[PDB]
Design a protein around this ligand. Structure first.
Ligand SMILES: Nc1ncnc2c1ncn2[C@@H]1O[C@H](COP(=O)(O)OP(=O)(O)O)[C@@H](O)[C@H]1O
Ligand SMILES: Nc1ncnc2c1ncn2[C@@H]1O[C@H](COP(=O)(O)OP(=O)(O)O)[C@@H](O)[C@H]1O
Lengths: 375, 55, 55, 375, 188
């Protein structure tokens, strides 16, 4: 339905896919990274029932479906399901497809090599894209934030990367890969809500919990004070209506789940916590770099939407950082949608038009070309 | 019949008592066998390490 | 008493069958335990020989 | 009749409850967790007729009683009925009044908190127990089974908990709680027997089916080949005599019902099955842990009593498992009775005499005390 | 368990600790420079389980432990863990109580001063060693190699000091210290 001869952009994780076309400042639509399948045998005639559901179809019908997510902590392994997700995304809902447009897909800086190779290959071989470019989420996070310099706290669905860039250059030894993201926070909340008498086991139930979390949970500027009160009084509880007519209230659990980011030990993870990983991405860089990264701590990805996270992360780093120097967190409304936006910026910059793999070079070289042309 | 529930029960109880002694031996012997087999494989793995180190 | 005999008897026969199975399982495990002990002694002696041939 | 203030121990499941005193190796008495109530008025003289029936009384007169289980998927929701069960259990069959003896009760690691609070509160406020301690079923399963390390599959009536333990420590990141249990197998068997012409729809009928299941059913080491044979020949059928003199036989139904453990979709549950659930508990654990958990897969609770479950589970995990690793299932005669036995072991350990809540600490703190004192 | 009051030697690197007695041609035992601590909540009662594990204990029970190294790029910062490692090393496994034996420790010549000062303090105050000597890796390497003259490029776990020695003399103006070592190669 679109007639603008621009690039297309998609951010694909273990939870959601943000997508639209390059040159704008927002995705046109956001789809779940889901291929749904019926988990029941139909009995009655005229009950519909699809063999497969894609994206929002899978999420909307989830009460009777098993929901599969193709991306594992940042890597696409089920490329067949991503092809279905991308077809729906582009052809059915965004109303624009790669066949007539160059396409940019994103990944984390240390994401296994197979991910960028398959993203490049599927757009060229199943979507017939005229050109490709696999982007680094850290690059996109700073473009969308108005920075060339800063720490990218790309807290996604399956992984948080924690990666510094200075004057447009990578500082890779200072990357603190962390196995804690929005999907793990959802799983933890399912377990602590089970402790409150509301067990959540199935994937439809996981989606209910993700909705509860996104609307009711927060990290808190001061965890211990919120905890002591919330664990002692109903005045700190918040109600949510479950899609069966039950009402669930959440007290200190409302923040204990989100707290996992600062205390990963809550889910059995071996990690110093998001504020120390942020601190180390700054501290492991050279001393004439450190000061600029402290002043430019940039949030991207989701989980950045928890109340108290932009104020808390600044508090936790300034408390570890030396005095006089100003420590600042950048946390715009483009929060969680900023990687897509950065993709739009990179794809459309004139300074990037020589970075695209055309369907010339690709056909002669094959998918290994991504390591010659992208990064 | 008069004493047959008793004969059968005493047989059942004696057999159960012996079964248990033998089932406990079976478990002890199996755990020793598995641990011993793991020791065997431990040493067999070492035979290869020493064989390889030796060659 | 038929019910008590029958219950005692199903147990007498099953318990005897099970005690036999327990004795046979513990016997086979004991024999296999010994085979594993001998095979282990074998790997331990071969290990010392490879370890020594190696030293 | 005891010459020491030994703790009394009660393993109260959603199905059956086992009881005895600490220091024994078996419960002294077993009762269903049931309080029965008549739905009919008796006519004949000399027919008993109570307002309510407890434990074995509910089963003996069940033909006209509604049988209520006060425990729902591991949690007591009806405390009045548990008081009837505990009075009868401790006072009439164990012959001990709790007033002069400490009491140990059990719950799953993710069992809703209100369960531990009511178990503790009832014994302190209704029975005046001098002390209380709510045990972890995973611990008790390991102490009865002779392990400190392994996978605990406690396959209870209301829930299969599934928790890996290493060197006496929980590995909570790998708990995969499953809402598929012995109660669903009984309900499914009532329905599959109905398909064969033997309808079971009442509470009395539920208990009949429960007894049929326990004596006639098995999982089968190879479902499809066993099914094809059972569906083709009477050689795999087994009879059972019903209370009214009718005879029921079960064919491939004999395993199709138990198969629900491996295929939960049969009862409408979204799950990969007990063997993948078990496997999920062994691979998610750390690289230097996995080997010890594979070699120590521990069964406790009931359903573990199906003739082919220890061997099929060992086979399924082996099939999912990497090579080199030794896979072994421990399926002791203390099966279904293991949690109670572990309770006896725990209550009497010298290392656990400081873990008891006294009826001093309890009254000063209130019912929530169990949260900080037990686990 | 030794029959002579020889000196003890303990090479405490950022990686592993090699230790044994003076006059031998090899360490008698090698321990990692590690103190391990559980990162999990205990479930079972009466399981023993330590608050911290030392040396080979830390690696043996590592499945649920986080393992920390008291020494960073060649310098001890966590002396408490060093004392635990030394007590285990000297009293449980090497079977040499420092109170009855003088002890030699090792370090790069540009290793910050706190390292040599703290190691000396602990052996004299917590172990009651009759004597001490902190030796330099470049000296130690030329003796081990049968040289008086040469460049010692110690590509160890912590920091590389690159130190030239001629006719037994240091040539300090030519030392090139590099912040690259085996621990970084592992991280790469
Ligand atoms: N209101 C919110 N509260 C808490 N967490 C949030 C909120 N919004 C987003 N997040 C988390 O972030 C995830 C989506 O963010 P996103 O970074 O765009 O994922 P991706 O990079 O894979 O596209 C969700 O799974 C959710 O867990
Ligand atoms: N032979 C068997 N076949 C099938 N299911 C069984 C068998 N034995 C026991 N079970 C089932 O296991 C459950 C027993 O629950 P239980 O483990 O004793 O609770 P708890 O552990 O708290 O004491 C019931 O649903 C029972 O029918």
């Amino acid at each position: 339905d679109e007639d603008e001869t621009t690039a297309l952009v998609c951010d694909n994780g273990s939870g959601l896919v943000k997508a639209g076309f390059a040159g704008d400042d927002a995705p046109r639509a956001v789809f779940p990274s889901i291929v749904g399948r019926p988990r029941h045998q139909g009995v009655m005639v005229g009950m519909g029932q699809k063999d497969s559901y894609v994206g929002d179809e899978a999420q909307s019908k989830r009460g009777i479906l098993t929901l599969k997510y193709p991306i594992e902590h940042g890597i696409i392994t089920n490329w067949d399901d991503m092809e279905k997700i991308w077809h729906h995304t582009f052809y059915n809902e965004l109303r624009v497809a790669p066949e007539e447009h160059p396409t940019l897909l994103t990944e984390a800086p240390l994401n296994p090599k197979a991910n960028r190779e398959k993203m490049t290959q599927i757009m060229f071989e199943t979507f017939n894209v005229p050109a490709m470019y696999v982007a680094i989420q850290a690059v996109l996070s700073l473009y969308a934030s108005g920075r060339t310099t800063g720490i990218v706290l790309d807290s996604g669905d399956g992984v948080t990367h924690n990666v510094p860039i200075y004057e447009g250059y990578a500082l890779p030894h200072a990357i603190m890969r962390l196995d804690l993201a929005g999907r793990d926070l959802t799983d933890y909340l399912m377990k602590i809500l089970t402790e409150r008498g509301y067990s959540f086991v199935t994937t439809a139930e996981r989606e209910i919990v993700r909705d509860i979390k996104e609307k009711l949970c927060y990290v808190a500027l001061d965890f211990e004070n919120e905890m002591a009160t919330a664990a002692s009084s109903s005045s700190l509880e918040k109600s949510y209506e479950l899609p069966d007519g039950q009402v669930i209230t959440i007290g200190n659990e409302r923040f204990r789940c989100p707290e996992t980011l600062f205390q990963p030990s809550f889910i059995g993870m071996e990690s110093a916590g998001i504020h120390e990983t942020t601190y180390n991405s700054i501290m492991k860089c050279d001393i004439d770099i450190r000061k600029d990264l402290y002043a430019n701590n940039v949030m991207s990805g989701g989980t950045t939407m928890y109340p108290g996270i932009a104020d808390r992360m600044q508090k936790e780093i300034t408390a570890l950082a030396p005095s006089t120097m100003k420590i600042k967190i950048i946390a715009p409304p483009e929060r969680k949608y900023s990687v897509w936006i950065g993709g739009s910026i990179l794809a459309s910059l004139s300074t990037f038009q020589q970075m695209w793999i055309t369907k010339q070079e690709y056909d002669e070289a094959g998918p290994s070309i991504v390591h010659r042309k992208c990064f | 019949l008069k004493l047959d529930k008793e004969n059968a029960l005493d047989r059942a109880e004696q057999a159960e008592a012996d079964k248990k002694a033998a089932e406990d031996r079976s478990k002890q012997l199996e755990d020793e066998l598995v641990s011993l087999q793991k020791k065997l494989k431990g040493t067999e793995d070492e035979l290869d390490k020493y064989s390889e180190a030796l060659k």
